[PDB]
Enzyme design. Structure first.
Site, PDB file in Angstrom:
ATOM      1  N   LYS A 182      -2.143   2.146  16.307  1.00  0.00           N
ATOM      2  CA  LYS A 182      -1.923   1.226  15.204  1.00  0.00           C
ATOM      3  C   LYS A 182      -1.726  -0.194  15.723  1.00  0.00           C
ATOM      4  CE  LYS A 182       1.286   0.357  11.367  1.00  0.00           C
ATOM      5  NZ  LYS A 182       2.519   0.817  10.689  1.00  0.00           N
ATOM      6  N   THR A 202       6.440   4.484   8.924  1.00  0.00           N
ATOM      7  CA  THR A 202       7.666   3.846   9.384  1.00  0.00           C
ATOM      8  C   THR A 202       8.686   4.872   9.881  1.00  0.00           C
ATOM      9  OG1 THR A 202       7.250   2.220   7.622  1.00  0.00           O
ATOM     10  CG2 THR A 202       9.293   1.978   8.881  1.00  0.00           C
ATOM     11  N   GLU A 209      -0.007   7.678   3.328  1.00  0.00           N
ATOM     12  CA  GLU A 209       1.237   7.889   4.054  1.00  0.00           C
ATOM     13  C   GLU A 209       2.423   7.382   3.251  1.00  0.00           C
ATOM     14  OE1 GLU A 209       0.218   5.154   7.416  1.00  0.00           O
ATOM     15  OE2 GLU A 209       2.208   4.445   7.065  1.00  0.00           O
TER      16      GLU A 209
END
Lengths: 202, 204, 203, 204
Positions: B130, B70, B41
Site C-alpha cells: 500500500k 487501518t 474494506e
C-alpha cells in the site's frame, strides 16, 4: 501542560544568531511582538548561554526550550541550562527515556506513517513535522484519518501567505523562523505582530 | 494467498469505508457493492468495526470480498480475522502483524512511503504494498521503483478522484484505493458515484 | 482618551538614549517588561525616526509620545512623526495653542502655585510636576486644598523605594526615567517588571 | 576512500546506465565517456552487469571510473567488488552491505529519503549519501537538511534534466546522478547529449 500552552499560543519562534548578544536582542523583539514560545537552536556555537541568559524572560512569561538536539549529551546540557522542552528531527529512544525520567517535554520529529506509529508506541501524541515544505498541509489533513489522536507542529513551508492553511489542515501550532526571525529587532517585532494577527483570525 | 493478486488485478478498485455507526457502514457497503465494487474494506476507526465485518455474509455470497482496514495492532488484526476478514490492511509496516497473518494464512498488505521501507517489506515476502499517502508521493514514485524494485506492485490509498485515476493506472499500479471520493453522501448517490469509478477505469 | 490611558497604566517610561538604535532597543525592552506609555525625548539623535519606526508597536497596544519639547516647531515636527502626546518641562502657550488646534494631548510642566494657576486657567487639568525630587510628595498633597481638580504626573525622584509614596499622595501616574531605562535591554526589561509589579501592589 | 569525495566534486556528474545486453552497455559507457563524463555507474539490473564492469577495464586506464549501481544485496556487492567496481551504490540503507564494504575498503553510498534515515546512515560513518527519488523530495530537501546536518553531502538520482541541473547545484549538492535524461538511444545521440550536460554544469 505543554499541549495546553502550544494549543493556546499557536506559534513558536525558532532563533539562531551570530552571537549570544544578538540572540538576546532578537528574543526580546519576538517576545515584545506577542510570541511567548521560543526555541533556541543547539547546533550553533555557544547556545548554552543563550538559554541561560534568557532566564529573565521566563518570569515575564516566556517559555524557552532547545531545538535541533541530536545527541543525549546535548539534551543533558539543554536541561540544566533550564530548557523546558527539547525538539529533535528524528525519534530517539535515549532522549525520550531521559526526558521521561527527568520531567522534560520532548517533541520527536517524523516524516512518514511508519515513523509516526513508532513514536506513538513511546507515548508521543505531539509530533514535529519535518520538512514542512516537502510533505505540506495535505500530509497533515490526511494522517488525520487513521491517526485522529496525533497533532503536528511543522517547520518550513510556513509563512504569512499560507500560515492559515496549516491550521485548516489541523495543526496544533506552527514553528517559524527567518520569515519570522530575521533582520534588525525593529523589523523582527513587526513580523511577529503580523503573524499573531493572521493566526488569530484563522 | 496468491488468489488476492488476481482479485486486485481484475477489479482494480478498493473501497475504503469509514463511519460513525454500524447502520450506515452496512448501508454504504451495500451501495458500493451495488455500484460494481467487489473489494471492500471496513476500517477499525469506526465503532464496532468487528460487528460490521460479520453482518456482511450476504455480500460474500454474491462474490464480494470483505477485509479490514487501518489495523494498527496484533489484537485488532486477530479480532478482524475471527470476524471473517479475508485480508488485513495497515498504514505502516509491522512485523508482529505480518507474522500473525502468515501463521493464520490471511493476506496482509502493509503500507510504505520510502524505498527503505519498501525493501524491508519486500524482504518479508510482501510483493503487494500500500502506498500512503499517495498525494505526497504521487504517480512518479511508482515509475521510479520499477528500476530497483521491478517485482513490486502498488495499491495507492490517498487522493484518488475521477480526474487522477487514469494517471495512476498508466504508472503501472495494480489497483487503486478510494476513500471519500467514492464513499460519501446518501446511499443513492454512493451507488451511482461508485459506478462512475468503475466505468472510467474501464476506458483507461 | 489619554487622560484615561494614564489612569489605567499608572506609569510612563521617559526614554533618553545616546543613539537612534539604542532608543529603539530600549523601547522594546520596556514594552516587553510591561510599560505601554513611552515618551521619546528630543535629546535623542534622529528622535523623529525613532517615533515613526515604533509606529508598529501601536498595533500591539503601545502608546508613543514625545518629550522635552521646548518649542512649537519641535512640537509640530513630532505630531507629524506620530506623537500621540507632547510633554514639555515648562508652560509654553505657543505649544499649548498649537496642540489645541491639532487635537494633541499636551502636558505642560509646573513647579509653583503661580505656574499651576496660569496653566490650569489655560485648559490644562493634568500637569507635569518637575523636578519631582525637589518638591516631593508634599507638594502634591498640599495642592489638594486650593486645587482639588488638578492631577499630577511627577518626573524625577521616583524609584522603587518611594514609588508608592507618590501614589499615597495622590498622583495620577509616575514618570520614570534613568532608574527604569538605564542599562542594557536584558536589565531594562527586568527593572521595568518590578516597577509594574510594585505599583500593582500599592495603587 | 576519502579520495572519492574529490573525484565526485571535480566531475559533478554521474552517468547511470541500463542495458539489455553487454554490447549496449559497453557502447553507452563509451559514448558518455567521450561526452566528458568520467563517473560511470553500471546497474545490477542488467543480467550481465559483472561482465560489463570487467570488460570496461580499458576505460579505467583512460581515467574513467566504473562503479556498480542498484546493489540490493551482499551477494551482488561481493560480485561487484570482485569485478573491479570502484564504488557501490544502493537505493536504500543496508547495514549488511555497509559492513561488507567497510571490511573490503570499497566506497559505499547508501540511499536516504527522510531525516531519520539520514541520521541513522551517518552513525555508520557515511557522509556522502544518495538522495532518492530526487524528484519526490526535490532541492528543498537538500536545503532543509543543510541546517541540522551541515556535514552531509548529497548526490540526487532522478529528477535531473537540463532545466534543473542548475537549480540542484544552487542547493549545495555535491554531484548529480543522471539516468535516461543523459543515456538514451544510440551513441552519437548519447555522446552529444552527455556533452550538453557537462557544458551547462560548467555554466552554473
Amino acid at each position: 501542560k505543554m499541549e495546553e500552552l502550544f494549543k493556546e499560543h499557536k506559534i513558536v519562534a525558532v532563533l539562531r544568531a551570530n552571537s549570544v548578544e544578538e540572540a538576546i536582542s532578537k528574543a526580546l523583539a519576538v517576545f515584545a511582538g506577542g510570541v511567548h514560545l521560543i526555541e533556541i537552536t543547539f547546533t550553533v556555537p555557544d547556545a548554552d548561554q543563550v538559554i541561560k541568559e534568557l532566564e529573565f524572560l521566563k518570569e515575564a512569561g516566556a517559555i524557552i526550550g532547545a531545538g535541533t538536539v541530536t545527541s543525549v549529551e546535548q539534551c543533558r546540557e539543554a536541561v540544566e541550562s533550564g530548557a523546558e522542552f527539547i525538539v529533535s528531527f528524528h525519534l530517539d529512544e535515549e532522549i525520550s527515556q531521559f526526558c521521561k525520567e527527568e520531567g522534560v517535554f520532548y517533541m520527536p520529529g517524523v516524516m512518514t506513517p511508519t515513523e509516526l506509529v513508532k513514536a506513538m508506541k513511546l507515548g508521543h501524541t505531539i509530533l514535529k513535522l519535518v520538512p514542512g515544505e516537502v510533505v505540506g498541509p495535505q500530509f497533515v489533513e490526511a494522517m488525520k484519518g487513521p491517526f485522529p489522536n496525533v497533532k503536528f507542529v511543522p517547520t518550513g513551508g510556513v509563512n504569512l501567505d499560507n500560515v492559515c492553511e496549516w491550521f485548516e489542515a489541523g495543526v496544533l501550532a506552527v514553528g517559524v523562523g527567518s520569515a519570522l526571525v530575521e533582520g534588525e529587532p525593529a523589523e523582527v517585532a513587526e513580523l511577529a505582530i503580523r503573524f499573531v494577527e493572521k493566526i488569530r483570525g484563522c
